[PDB]
């Protein structure tokens, strides 16, 4: 069972959360989630983004055609894997564009219910209830600015996926390592759950030197 069903009336109209619908919710989140990190940690110029209403907040998403096209491929793929419960982690690695030194690493742990595919009926949780949990995560990600180390140099980012050793991955994806920061500190953030998938967020940064 579980605890934050949402409005009974809303629920009566929506019916519930199915495995596929959960997969979209979660993939959609990584779309906004990534756009948000890239924007607030200034990985890309701020004039590069544009305002949008989502989750009851005003978020910023990229305007760069190539990036836009890129994230979509990730999202759509992330969507397939989530339906089948194949991806366990999604990591955004941030590093020095020149040296290559990893300076900050955002980690997302995904928990999925293997049995959801055999449900007799949709799970009792409103769309709005799930959005409120997500909005709570995004605000925290924002408040993160005060203590995180400033990223003075020019950075780039990379997307890492962590799954089960029997996944046939597309050509665009290449084998890799965890890419941990050699010496760090980390803060565990809030999570949200669609009652089918659960996402835990956390951020690690290199410990300030000199």
């Amino acid at each position: 069972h579980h605890h934050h069903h949402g409005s009974a009336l809303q629920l009566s109209r929506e019916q519930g959360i199915t495995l596929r619908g959960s997969a979209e919710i979660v993939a959609e989140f990584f779309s906004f989630g990534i756009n948000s990190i890239l924007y607030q940690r200034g990985i890309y110029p701020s004039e590069t983004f544009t305002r949008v209403q989502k989750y009851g907040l005003t978020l910023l998403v990229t305007t760069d055609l190539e990036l836009i096209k890129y994230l979509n491929n990730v999202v759509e793929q992330l969507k397939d894997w989530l339906y089948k419960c194949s991806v366990q982690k999604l990591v955004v690695v941030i590093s020095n564009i020149e040296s290559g030194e990893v300076l900050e690493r955002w980690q997302f742990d995904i928990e999925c219910d293997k049995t959801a595919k055999d449900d007799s009926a949709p799970r009792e949780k409103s769309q709005k209830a799930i959005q409120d949990e997500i909005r709570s995560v995004i605000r925290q990600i924002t408040a993160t600015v005060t203590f995180l180390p400033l990223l003075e140099v020019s950075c780039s980012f990379d997307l890492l996926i962590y799954t089960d050793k029997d996944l046939v991955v597309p050509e665009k994806w290449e084998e890799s390592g965890p890419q941990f920061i050699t010496n760090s500190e980390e803060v565990r953030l809030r999570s949200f759950t669609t009652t089918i998938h659960k996402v835990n967020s956390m951020v690690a940064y290199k410990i300030p030197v000199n």
Partner: peptide
């Protein structure tokens, strides 16, 4: 197992 898919080279 880890897999990477890098964004376009700015």
């Amino acid at each position: 197992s880890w897999y990477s898919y890098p964004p376009p080279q700015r």
